[PDB]
Design a protein around this ligand. Structure first.
Ligand SMILES: [Zn+2]
Lengths: 192, 79, 59, 126, 49, 182, 136
RNA sequence: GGUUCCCUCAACCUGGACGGCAAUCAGGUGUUGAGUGUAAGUGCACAAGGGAGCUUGACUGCGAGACGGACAUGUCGAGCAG
């Protein structure tokens, strides 16, 4: 697994605050912060539409290469602030990384396949933690429910991870819990 | 029907009377309270009903010693 | 040890039915006691008139 | 591998004494005008000090480790009298004439009481 | 009255110097206690009337 | 001048016996015996005062010292027990007086139990202490059987410096406790 | 109908209806959910009517989660009485709902029947609402 | 009640004649979840909580300085002498 950093242009902010951040958003920008082992946080700005396009096609853990006044800098997306109602991106944290560094990251697990026709699939944990290289983070993790019959606890320790990726969360999480499908009498009694 | 409630008692005007940096005389009341939310410090005593009063003239100063909030009196140097 | 609150306590001597003797201290005013079972007599340690009545009149 | 189960009597005895020394020190305190006489006792020796609690400084100190105290041919309490007289001479050589007694947690009696009465007949009043 | 009011008097000058309460079930007898008697000027035995 | 036999036996026949068996690093780690405590939970003393009085009379004869009178620390309605009244007795033994009791218990009293079959070795207190009870009290020669009113047993417990039960059994069997083969 | 076993205080002030939801604004258990867009008090009678409507549409399979509980009592004084003389006895239990909160969830194998099922539940509630999924 | 000195609970695990979830005994874990005559609140493990010895200050003449206050009430107090 290897990745290509996504080019983004970051402008150093002049004024910070709640008044200045609101104005920046009205112009189609997202405030962002570049901390890490640089140990001197930079308060940057990013194009709102261009930043979100990188997230769409590469996920939340997107590697970025930024252009701060002519100088490049490898950055990782650490966290995103999203409005519950408008589904905006109000803020973003960027963590400085270098090639070969190991970072602990939460990646999504996806359920695929078609199990026994008399069963219902209920995925418990949405994400699991790993620890891969800066440029070698998987964009998704895949599990398969094929021919899985009745009650089986698929566990976080049974997920096929690529080379160089080590599971950080405990290996006994319940990720996918295939169960016998509820009946019309199980629906009625549950919830009263 | 009716209501079984409707009682209450007189407010006792508890609280901090002299605040930080405020010059006081000797024997003057600093804090009125129920328990020892504030413990006495230097030149401060505790009354019968847990009242803190100054034992010497000076300036009030709040501190903290071994996890306890305290009230201290520091002297004022004569000109 | 307080003075006048404890039972009167004097060295004694035990003599068993197997001939064994000790030198111990107990509370008995007599000064000695005699016992027919000791560490050397009881079967469980060693591993070895009703009995005599049936073994004399009947055999 | 040996794994002890509980607490040795040394640990129980030590923490209990510091527990009852702090209960003592909630009243007594040291000032340059009226210092505090702290006494520490062990199975072999006995120590004293004159501590000024306002700034945390020790004025004078006498102990049974001194070569001249060892020469005494009495018992342990005989050395405590010697140690008490030394601190009274050193207390008055620094202008101190009134002190307050800090027994350190130990029971007042025996070796501790021998030292205090030795320092009382020698000039110090407390 | 269970807890009535009693007057303690000096046993030397018979002066009634104090008044207090006691439970006459827990203490059926007259209360005997030492209190300062201003007329005598010293602590004297005071006994209930 | 002299010593009790068990202390004499323990000092230079038992102490080094444990040395090669358990291979200690310091002589300070060799287990010993700390104290023995004799208890009688009367229980039915909530009904009469004569019950608690009798127990403390016998217990002085068994050991050789006055007992306490352990008062209840709780009020229990189901037991008709109100806090603050006698419910039991207790004696602890240390030093010489402990060793004689351990001498007489093994030599005289223990084999005097009817149809005696030893003592179970599984009654150890997790960390190397042993306790056991008796249904009666007539197995002692310091009492007179005619004067005996009713059975009133004890709860003998022996406190040792042993770390675990494995070392607790080793010390106790050396003294001579008759452990069953199970 | 959901009713708490016991509440410490029976007669309480009205829950405040200001701000937007701090927590619970995302789907955690099921695949689809109902997100609120207005403030209201959702009564347990409306919750029961709104999860039966989900049941009657998916029929056999699938699982339904309810993310809110009617904890807070609203009192009503007896009818045709003048104002005064105390505070009335509690009658109905509500859940303080703020915009952004996710009320119901559903886990059904196909999409069209699951989205249709949740719409039938929205028409039983006194607020505007929308259907959300687990994806960003 | 005053003073002087000593102590750390509740709960849980294990072993013990009646004895059991729970009585008395023993070991370990346990920093406050127990307890504070009596409602609640503010406090109290430094203990204001548990135990023991002596005891009557549950005093007499006073009281700088304050809190609170329509007024009348009410409240705290170092220090002096017997
Ligand atoms: Zn008189």
């Amino acid at each position: 697994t290897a990745n290509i950093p996504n080019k983004l242009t970051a402008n150093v902010r002049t004024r910070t605050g709640k008044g200045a951040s609101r104005q920046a958003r009205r112009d189609g920008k997202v405030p962002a912060v570049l901390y890490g082992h640089g140990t001197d946080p930079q308060h940057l700005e990013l194009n709102a539409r261009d930043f979100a396009a990188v997230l769409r096609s590469h996920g939340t853990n997107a590697i970025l290469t930024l252009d701060i006044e002519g100088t490049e800098q490898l950055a990782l997306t650490k966290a995103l602030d999203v409005h519950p109602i408008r589904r905006n991106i109000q803020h973003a944290d960027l963590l400085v990384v270098q090639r070969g560094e190991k970072v602990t990251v939460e990646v999504t697990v996806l359920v695929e396949g078609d199990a026994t026709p008399g069963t219902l699939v209920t995925q418990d944990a949405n994400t699991i933690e790993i620890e891969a290289e800066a440029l070698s983070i998987p964009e998704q993790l895949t599990v398969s429910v094929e021919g899985v019959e009745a009650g089986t606890q698929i566990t976080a320790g049974q997920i096929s991870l690529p080379e160089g990726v080590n599971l950080i969360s405990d290996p006994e999480l319940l990720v996918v819990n295939v169960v016998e499908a509820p009946s019309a009498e199980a629906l009625e009694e549950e919830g009263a | 029907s009716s209501s079984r409630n409707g009682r209450d008692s007189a407010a006792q005007r508890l609280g901090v009377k002299r605040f930080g940096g405020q010059v006081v005389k000797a024997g003057e009341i600093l804090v009125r309270q129920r328990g020892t939310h504030f413990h006495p410090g230097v030149n401060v005593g505790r009354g019968g009903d847990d009242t803190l009063f100054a034992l010497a003239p000076g300036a009030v100063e709040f501190g903290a010693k071994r996890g306890r909030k305290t009230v201290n009196i520091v002297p004022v140097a004569r000109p | 040890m307080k003075t006048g609150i404890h039972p009167e306590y004097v060295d004694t001597t035990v003599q068993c039915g197997c001939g064994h003797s000790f030198t111990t201290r107990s509370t008995k005013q007599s000064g000695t006691i005699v016992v027919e079972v000791c560490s050397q007599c009881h079967p469980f340690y060693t591993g070895k008139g009703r009995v005599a009545r049936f073994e004399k009149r009947y055999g | 591998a040996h794994k002890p189960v509980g607490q040795n009597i040394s640990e129980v005895r030590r923490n209990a004494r510091l527990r009852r020394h702090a209960r003592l020190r909630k009243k007594v305190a040291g000032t340059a005008e009226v210092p505090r006489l702290v006494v520490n006792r062990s199975a072999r020796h006995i120590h004293v000090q004159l501590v000024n609690d306002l700034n945390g400084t020790t004025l004078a100190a006498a102990s049974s480790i001194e070569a001249d105290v060892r020469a005494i041919d009495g018992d342990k309490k005989a050395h405590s009298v010697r140690v008490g007289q030394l601190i009274a001479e050193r207390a008055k050589a620094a202008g101190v004439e009134t002190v307050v007694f800090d027994r350190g947690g130990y029971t007042y009696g025996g070796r501790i009481a021998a030292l205090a009465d030795a320092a009382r007949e020698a000039g110090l009043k407390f | 009255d269970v807890r009535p009011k009693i007057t303690l008097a000096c046993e030397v000058c018979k002066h009634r110097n104090y008044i207090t309460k006691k439970n006459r079930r827990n203490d059926p007898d007259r209360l005997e206690i030492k209190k300062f008697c201003p007329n005598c000027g010293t602590h004297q035995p005071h006994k209930e009337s | 001048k002299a010593l009790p036999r068990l202390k004499q036996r323990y000092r230079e026949e038992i102490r080094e016996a444990l040395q090669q068996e358990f291979n200690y690093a310091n002589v300070m780690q060799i287990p010993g015996v700390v104290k023995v405590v004799v208890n009688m939970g009367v229980g039915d003393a909530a009904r009469d005062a004569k019950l608690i009085n009798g127990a403390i009379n016998d217990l002085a004869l068994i050991t050789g010292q006055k007992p306490e009178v352990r008062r209840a620390r709780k009020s229990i309605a189901q037991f008709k027990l109100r806090e603050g009244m006698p419910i039991g007795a207790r004696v602890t033994l240390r030093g010489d007086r402990m060793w004689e009791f351990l001498d007489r218990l093994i030599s005289i009293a223990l084999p005097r139990i009817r149809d005696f079959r030893g003592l179970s070795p599984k009654q150890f207190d997790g960390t190397g202490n042993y306790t056991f009870g008796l249904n009666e009290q007539s197995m002692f020669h310091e009492i007179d059987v005619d004067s005996i009113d009713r059975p009133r047993g004890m709860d003998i417990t022996v406190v040792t410096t042993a770390t675990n039960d494995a070392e607790g059994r080793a010390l106790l069997r050396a003294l001579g406790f008759p452990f069953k083969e199970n | 109908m959901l009713i708490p076993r016991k509440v410490k205080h029976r007669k309480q002030h009205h829950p405040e209806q200001r701000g937007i939801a701090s927590g619970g604004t995302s789907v955690s258990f099921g695949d689809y959910g109902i997100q609120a867009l207005e403030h209201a008090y959702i009564t347990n009678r409306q919750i029961e009517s709104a999860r039966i409507a989900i049941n009657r549409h998916i029929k056999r399979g699938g699982k339904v989660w309810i993310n809110i509980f009617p904890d807070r009592p609203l009192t009503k004084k007896p009818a045709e009485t003048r104002m005064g003389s105390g505070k009335g006895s509690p009658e109905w239990w509500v859940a303080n709902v703020k915009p952004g909160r996710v009320l119901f969830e559903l886990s059904y194998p196909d999409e069209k029947t699951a989205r249709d099922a949740l719409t039938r539940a929205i028409h039983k509630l006194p607020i505007k609402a929308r259907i959300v999924t687990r994806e960003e």
